Amino acid sequence: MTEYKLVVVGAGGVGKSALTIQLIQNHFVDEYDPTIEDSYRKQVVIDGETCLLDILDTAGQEEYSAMRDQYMRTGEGFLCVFAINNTKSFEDIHHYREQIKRVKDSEDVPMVLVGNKCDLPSRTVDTKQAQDLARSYGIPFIETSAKTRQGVDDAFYTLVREIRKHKEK
Ligand SMILES: Nc1nc2c(ncn2[C@@H]2O[C@H](COP(=O)(O)OP(=O)(O)O)[C@@H](O)[C@H]2O)c(=O)[nH]1
Ligand SMILES: C[C@H](CN1c2ccccc2Sc2ccccc21)N(C)C
């Protein structure tokens, strides 16, 4: 069993805790405080390998910058989640990519672009927009929903596989 640290990165309100809890407790949560930051452990047999995925639902602003940079350095995978009905959080993705690349001091970082709330209207972020952005970062992009659970398992599985490829590079 290989232990893998899967951290979710995104803006406050994209559904970090929701998507995480959905796969951990197998149920959607409508009300959950965004300040709640905790990690969850889940052993999944991916490709014949039982990997222990340690998913982290971070809050945002830490008490100390060192701790911030620390959890980012030990993080193996970074799930970039945004809202398809919000351009603000979509543009915030550039900040995360830039930051993580500096914090880990590495350009090759296993990331996966995930567009949550694909079942909701007012879609401002075009699929082509996100796809092009993902291609520019050399990472995959999957539309998901914490409600319909569409492509959720796939998005997470891909993230783990991306890490693997980076490890066996
Ligand atoms: N409709 C809809 N609401 C979501 C979705 N994901 C999260 N939310 C809601 O966003 C609010 C905060 O969710 P939370 O788990 O705190 O996500 P976070 O604060 O971004 O980490 C709650 O009302 C969640 O139910 C989603 O995919 N669809
Ligand atoms: C995010 C932390 C655990 N953690 C960590 C804690 C303090 C300093 C550095 C780190 S390394 C890290 C990396 C990935 C997931 C969680 C952490 N905990 C709130 C779950």
Ligand nearest to the CA of 116: 1
Burial 33-56 (b: 16+ CB within 10 A, else e): eeeeeeebeeeeebeeeebebbbb
Run of H or E including 23: helix 16-24
Run of H or E including 152: helix 152-167
CB 9 within 8 A of CB 59: no
The domain ranges of the chain are 2-168
Burial 66-81 (b: 16+ CB within 10 A, else e): eebeebbeebbbbbbb
Q: What is residue 103's three-state secondary structure?
A: helix
**CATH number attached to the domain at 2-168:** 3.40.50.300
Which residue type occupies 91?
E
Tell me, in angstroms, the distance from the centre of ligand 1 to residue 28's CA. Answer: 9
CA distance 148 to 152: 9
CA distance 164 to 141: 17
For ligand 1, atom 2, which residue shows the shortest CA distance?
A: 117
Tokens of 64: 């100390």
CA distance 43 to 50: 6
CB 139 within 8 A of CB 108: no
Q: Tell me how the structure was determined.
A: NMR
Q: For the chain, percent helix, then strand, then coil, each to nearest 5?
A: 35, 25, 40
Task: Pick left, alpha or beta for residue 60 (phi over 0 → left; psi -120 to 50 → alpha; otherwise beta).
Answer: left
For ligand 1, atom 17, which residue shows the shortest CA distance?
A: 15
Tell me, in angstroms, the distance from the centre of ligand 1 to residue 105's CA. Answer: 31
Tokens of 140: 């995959």
Choose which residue among 17, 35, 56 to substitute to test ligand 2 binding: the one with the highest number of ligand atoms within 8 A of its C-beta.
56
Tokens of 133: 């952005």
Task: Pick left, alpha or beta for residue 105 (phi over 0 → left; psi -120 to 50 → alpha; otherwise beta).
Answer: left
The count of residues in the chain is 169
